[PDB]
Amino acid sequence: ANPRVFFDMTVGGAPAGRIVMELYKDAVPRTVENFRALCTGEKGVGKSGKPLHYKGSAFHRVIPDFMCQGGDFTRGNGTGGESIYGEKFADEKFVHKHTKPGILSMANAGPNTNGSQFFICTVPCNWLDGKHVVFGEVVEGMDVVKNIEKVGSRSGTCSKQVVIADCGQL
């Protein structure tokens, strides 16, 4: 089966609901395995000395009519993050494109720099195709996504903090 993982989100400390994501283990298993493990925290601590775990991390960059970005559990601002394999890992395959809201894809700093940061598209983003590895999609709680999207701004700054209060695997 393709794994399903979840985030229980808060916005300004207030519960916002659950996002459930299906991960395309069938297509991009190495990328999926990283994300799945970062939802459970099972692999221990990274090079940063922080837990390899999304729990407690935030969506630090949210841009309406584009995407929600999170996963920087080491610096909280887009300058950190790391994978269960080490700081960075290769782009596995570009077999899926950024075709619809709810697509889940890896943020990076150029080719072969995947860590832990990810984004959820809120529009089709074809200009990202070939540059970011798509590895899953939101299957429930897209409303929670759209509610987070509204707290964002053009600068990416959020009006209230958007936190993955809890996370794990179903």
Binding site: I63, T79, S105, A107, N108, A109, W127, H132, G156
Partner: peptide
């Protein structure tokens, strides 16, 4: 522009 980078956010 509209990118998703991790440390130097560009146009």
């Amino acid at each position: 522009x509209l990118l998703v980078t991790a440390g130097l956010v560009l146009a």
